[PDB]
Amino acid sequence: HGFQNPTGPIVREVNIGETITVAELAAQMSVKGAEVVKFMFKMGSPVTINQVLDQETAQLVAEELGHKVKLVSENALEEQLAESL
């Protein structure tokens, strides 16, 4: 069980709330914020470092960069106590 040097890139489990600042999105993918800003500039909508993004854009860009998105909701108990009846 020794060290096997990884070959491919890295993938993270990006947890996305109801909204997220692009700084936190860059933090959770282990990429620098400037790279995320330049990437969004390359395709359409420009951003700033502390601009707030919504579910659709954040999930689309994060899943495009290769990471797996695991989004969550702020009313969890409400659906929890809705499949019980």
Residue numbers in the entry: 248 to 332
Question: What is written in the article reporting this PDB entry?
Answer:
IF2 is the guanosine triphosphatase (GTPase) that guides the entry of the formyl-methionine initiator tRNA (fMet-tRNAifMet) into the peptidyl (P) site of the ribosome. In the small subunit (30 S) initiation complex, IF2-GTP holds fMet-tRNAifMet in a specific orientation and provides anchor points that accelerate joining of the large subunit (50 S), resulting in the formation of the 70 S initiation complex (70S-IC). Ribosome-stimulated GTP hydrolysis in IF2 and inorganic phosphate (Pi) release is accompanied by a series of conformational changes in IF2 and the ribosome, leading to the accommodation of fMet-tRNAifMet into the P site and IF2 dissociation from the ribosome. Initiation factor IF2 is the largest translation factor in Escherichia coli with an N-terminal region of variable length across bacterial species and a conserved C-terminal region that encompasses four domains.
Local refinement of this region yielded a 2.8-Å resolution map of the N2-globular sub-domain of IF2 interacting with helix h16 of 16 S rRNA. An initial model of the N2 sub-domain was generated with AlphaFold237, and then fit and refined into the density. Using this approach, we traced 85 additional residues (248 to 332), of which residues 266 to 312 form the three-helix bundle sub-domain N2 in IF2 not previously included in the E. coli 70S-IC structures. While structure alignment of the three-helix bundle N2 sub-domain of ribosome-bound P. aeruginosa IF2 (residues 266 to 312) with the NMR structure of the E. coli sub-domain N1 (residues 2–50)38 reveals reasonable homology with a root-mean-square-deviation (RMSD) value of 4.9 Å, alignment with the N/G1 domain from the crystal structure of ribosome-free T. thermophilus IF219,39 shows an almost perfect fit with RMSD of 1 Å. The overall shape of the N2-globular sub-domain complements that of helix h16 in the shoulder region of the 30 S subunit, with residues Ser277, Val278, Lys279 and Arg259 forming the main interface and the extension that emerges from the N2 sub-domain wrapping around the minor groove of h16. In the rotated 70S-IC (II-A), the buried surface area by extended IF2-GDPCP is ~5146 Å2, of which ~1173 Å2 is attributed to the N2 sub-domain. In the 70S-IC, the additional interactions provided by the N2 sub-domain further anchor IF2 on the ribosome, explaining how this region of IF2 stabilizes the binding of fMet-tRNAifMet to the P site of the 30S-IC and promotes joining of the 30 S and 50 S subunits. In the non-rotated 70S-IC the N2 region of compact IF2-GDP is not visible, indicating that the N2 sub-domain disengages from the 30 S shoulder and becomes labile upon back-rotation of the small subunit in the 70S-IC. The region of the N-domain of IF2 proximal to the G-domain that interacts with the 30 S subunit was previously called the N/G1 domain in T. thermophilus IF222,34, and shares high sequence similarity with the distal region of the N-domain of E. coli and P. aeruginosa IF2 (sub-domain N1).
